[PDB]
């Protein structure tokens, strides 16, 4: 029969974040952030903390799952909200065109840095790489991930 461990972590994470700190009272436990199957980062608990260094931008996520696993411990799971149909995200070479009536549009680069903010419509002039696009309507945020060659 496994025992319990104590885990405390924020309820939210910035779309631009680079790390995520989890307190846990079992040294050697493993804390991991994921979007079911995309493993976005992992750290071992040492001195009561795991500082998860994210391996990719999470700006294309609305939620992530925190999982903390330990030898003979009951696994602890938490949802974490990531905070920056009725739209289109278009790519054409180096330009990304985003449209959605009455929406906040945001674009983030592959280092999680926010590169563009506009209302309703924008054209963004990109560089080679992967971007996240956030379209924030009333009641709901959507995201897409765009590859620019």
Author numbering: 579 to 662, 672 to 736
Task: List passages from the publication reporting this PDB structure.
Translocation of gingipains from the periplasm across the OM is dependent on a conserved C-terminal domain (CTD), which appears to be important for secretion of the proteins and in particular, truncation of the last few C-terminal residues of this domain leads to accumulation of gingipains in the periplasm. Here, we show for the first time that the OM translocation signal, a conserved CTD of RgpB, has a typical Ig-like fold encompassing seven antiparallel β-strands organized in two β-sheets that are packed against each other in a β-sandwich.
However, diffraction quality crystals were obtained using mutants of the same construct, which included an inserted hexahistidine after residues S664 or I665 (recombinant products r664i6H and r665i6H, respectively), or by substitution of six consecutive linker residues (I665ADVAN670) with a factor Xa cleavage motif (IEGRAA; r665sXa). Each variant of rIgSF-CTD formed nearly identical crystal structures (RMSD of 0.760 Å for r665i6H and 0.327 Å for r665sXa, with respect to r664i6H for 298 aligned residues). The 9-residue linker (T663-D671) between the immunoglobulin-like subdomain and the CTD did not yield visible electron density, indicating that this fragment was disordered in the crystals. The lack of cleavage observed within the linker by elastase is clearly not due to inaccessibility of this loop to proteolytic enzymes, as proteins bearing the IEGRAA motif by insertion/substitution were efficiently cleaved at the Arg-Ala peptide bond by fXa. Interestingly, however, there was a clear difference in the kinetics of cleavage events, with r662iXa being far more susceptible to proteolysis than r665sXa. Taken together, these results demonstrate that insertion and substitution within the connecting linker do not affect domain structure or inter-domain arrangement, and suggest that the linker is resistant to proteolysis despite the presence of peptide bonds potentially susceptible to cleavage by HNE and PPE.
